[PDB]
Design a protein around this ligand. Structure first.
Ligand SMILES: [Ca+2]
Length: 314
DNA sequence: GGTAGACCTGGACGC
DNA sequence: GCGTCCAGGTCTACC
């Protein structure tokens, strides 16, 4: 009863709600779609993970987003804790307004948006987001979710244990940068990315200013940021893009990869024009990103999230 | 300045 | 049941 993961039904007094219609958010369409790989649907409709150094369980009803946090006596979340949630989901941004705009300038989006409401963007933590997507290159969401889990168990701060699951906070830069980490990561199966993680942790700390440098980009231009990030080992244009979009507040950043090419080609009959190649190339990718930008606007990145999400559901 | 592979890993085809 | 193909790409020789 008081043990294991909570459920709205079983521990009523331990939950608190945030006004939020499904139309403005769909947990099942956001949390497992590859923005963040730290959420797991332990119970049906209930998602658990680490949000702001604490473990939470989220679930929703037609017009409410019910929350519950595990920290010392169990109690409903506090208004300030609850704000951590609203901030993480950027609830101030009205998906309805965005969806409307995109829908009016793109008949196709209109078409797709009907069956996929509530796809918004999470505003993630720089570090967690940087190393997660570093693990994402040339890989699939299932493996990624796995690696990121082991990485946190191995180098993350132990939070709490629910049932047979022990939650860890995301590793710090110091930890990731530690002696012999690459070896360890390699045993955890991070593949050739083991080195990217280690190399980047050190690069950030031992030659870029450390955590502050990174957090500084959140105020720099998408241009600056994307530029700055590519410096890092394992970080290219696409990865630098996912990070700008989901952690650095650059909503026009449009991650381009095979997924987007399939979307572009199949639903827009898109082709590179001012580019040499016919297929994916650094020059063609940039073009595609620009295409989607001029199509959707300042929040092109968010619109991208909507389709990319629906492309995983194909 | 732009290309063509090589690449950890492991579930998904297809022979 | 065994070799391709592919997944939230990046990095590196090479013409
Ligand atoms: Ca590939």
């Amino acid at each position: 009863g008081s043990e294991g993961h909570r459920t709205l039904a079983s521990t009523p007094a331990l939950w608190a709600s945030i006004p939020c219609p499904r139309s403005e958010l769909r947990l099942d369409l956001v949390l497992p779609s590859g923005q963040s790989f730290r959420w797991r649907e332990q119970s049906p409709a209930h998602w658990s993970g680490v949000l702001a150094d604490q473990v939470w369980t989220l679930t929703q009803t037609e017009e409410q987003l019910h929350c519950t946090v595990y920290r010392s006596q169990a109690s409903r979340p506090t208004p300030d804790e609850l704000e951590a949630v609203r901030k993480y989901f950027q609830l101030d941004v009205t998906l309805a307004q965005l969806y409307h705009h995109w829908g009016s300038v793109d008949s196709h989006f209109q078409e797709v948006a009907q069956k996929f409401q509530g796809v918004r963007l999470l505003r993630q933590d720089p570090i967690e987001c940087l190393f997660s997507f570093i693990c994402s290159s040339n890989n699939n969401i299932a493996r990624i979710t796995g690696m990121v889990e082991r990485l946190c168990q191995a180098f993350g701060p132990r939070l709490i244990q629910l049932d047979d699951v022990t939650y860890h906070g995301f590793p710090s830069l110091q930890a990731l940068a530690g002696p012999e980490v690459e070896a360890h990561l390699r045993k955890l199966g991070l593949g050739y990315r083991a080195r990217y993680v280690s190399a980047s942790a050190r690069a950030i700390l031992e030659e870029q200013g450390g955590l502050a440098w990174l957090q500084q980009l959140r105020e720099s231009s998408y241009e600056e940021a994307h530029k700055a990030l590519c410096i890092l080992p394992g970080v290219g244009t696409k990865v630098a893009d996912c990070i700008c979009l989901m952690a650095l507040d650059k909503p026009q950043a449009v991650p381009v990869n095979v997924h987007m090419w399939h979307i572009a080609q199949r639903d827009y009959s898109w082709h590179p024009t001012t580019s040499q190649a016919k297929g994916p190339s650094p020059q063609t990718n940039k073009e595609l990103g620009n295409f989607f930008r001029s199509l959707w606007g300042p929040y092109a990145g968010w619109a991208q999230a909507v389709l990319f999400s629906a492309d995983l559901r194909q």
